[PDB]
Design a protein around this ligand. Structure first.
Ligand SMILES: COCCNS(=O)(=O)c1ccc(Nc2nccc(-c3sc(=O)n(C)c3C)n2)cc1
Length: 295
């Protein structure tokens, strides 16, 4: 801090508070995240975070500076003016126009393609972490912070962390999950943009899993070899039949439903990569429209 002048709270992220702040030399407005340290700050968290300062991409919220003092760490991010949650709320009556949904999905997949080529995972994608600007860009925020620490189930703020976007392999207690978890979260967000309702609004871990199962079918060894040996899998899970995607995300067109199906494959190895998603036929007519943002 010290060179920074708080102007308002824009989020109680999972790791700390997030303020809009004005840099008191350069005059730049930034998003300041005070990170809430367990005792001190692990040096490995510091080296983990430092590598992020280099992971720069048009679709990743730029980390400007990391600033360390005793039991407070600060991350200084470029400031964007709105998150996708708020923009989706704002768009609730008419929905986001599909061309703009498509552009946002395409850009994010580009972001994810980049991170994953550097072996960096987000692990916690959600509409609150997807930030937009007036020029039609969308960016991944709060990014690779999960590996740097871990994610508590209860943030310092006593708001519950959302499970709505969590890949099934995480929920079934796999320890060493992959990039494919981010593809899953992004498909849940795609679906939500299209339908204007959360796809799997779980309010505990088993409600979340049983919501996935109801829509997609209870997974078995036919669709997900190895599933039945995962740490939190129980042979006593109820066996639901799969619903059709025509019912899940109307009125998404066939290309979009086919891409979404690949993003939502149970087996993280059959799940489409970000890079392969970019070549899907759904992005043959991609464009970059301007949102109607009300700031
Ligand atoms: C009433 O409005 C409250 C809803 N939040 S909001 O207004 O849409 C919003 C406004 C601005 C921002 N800006 C912003 N810019 C850069 C980074 C961030 C975030 S969001 C997040 O979780 N982190 C860690 C960061 C750095 N936020 C984020 C959210």
């Amino acid at each position: 801090m010290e060179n920074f002048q708080k102007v308002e709270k824009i989020g109680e992220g999972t790791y700390g508070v997030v303020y809009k702040a004005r840099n008191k030399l350069t005059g730049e407005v930034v998003a300041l995240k005070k990170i809430r340290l367990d005792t001190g700050v692990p040096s490995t968290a510091i080296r983990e975070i430092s590598l992020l300062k280099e992971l720069n991409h048009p679709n990743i919220v730029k980390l400007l500076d990391v600033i360390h003092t005793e039991n407070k760490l600060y991350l200084v991010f470029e400031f964007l003016h709105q998150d996708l949650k708020k923009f989706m709320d704002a768009s609730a009556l008419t929905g986001i126009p599909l061309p703009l949904i498509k552009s946002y999905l395409f850009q994010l997949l580009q972001g994810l393609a980049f991170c994953h080529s550097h072996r960096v995972l987000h692990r916690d994608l959600k509409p609150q972490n997807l930030l937009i600007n007036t020029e039609g860009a969308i960016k991944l925020a709060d990014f690779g912070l999960a590996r740097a620490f871990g994610v508590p189930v209860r943030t310092y703020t006593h708001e519950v962390v959302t499970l709505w976007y969590r890949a099934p392999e995480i929920l079934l207690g796999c320890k060493y999950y992959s990039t494919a978890v981010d593809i899953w979260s992004l498909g849940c967000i795609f679906a939500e943009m299209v339908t204007r309702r959360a796809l799997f609004p779980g309010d505990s871990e088993i409600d979340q899993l049983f919501r996935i199962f109801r829509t997609l079918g209870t997974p078995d060894e036919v669709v997900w070899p190895g599933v039945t040996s995962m740490p939190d899998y129980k042979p006593s899970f109820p066996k639901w039949a799969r619903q059709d995607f025509s019912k899940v995300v109307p009125p998404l067109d066939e290309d979009g439903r086919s891409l979404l199906s690949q993003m939502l494959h149970y087996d993280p190895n059959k799940r489409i990569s970000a890079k392969a998603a970019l070549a899907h036929p759904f992005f043959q007519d991609v464009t970059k429209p301007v949102p109607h943002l009300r700031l």
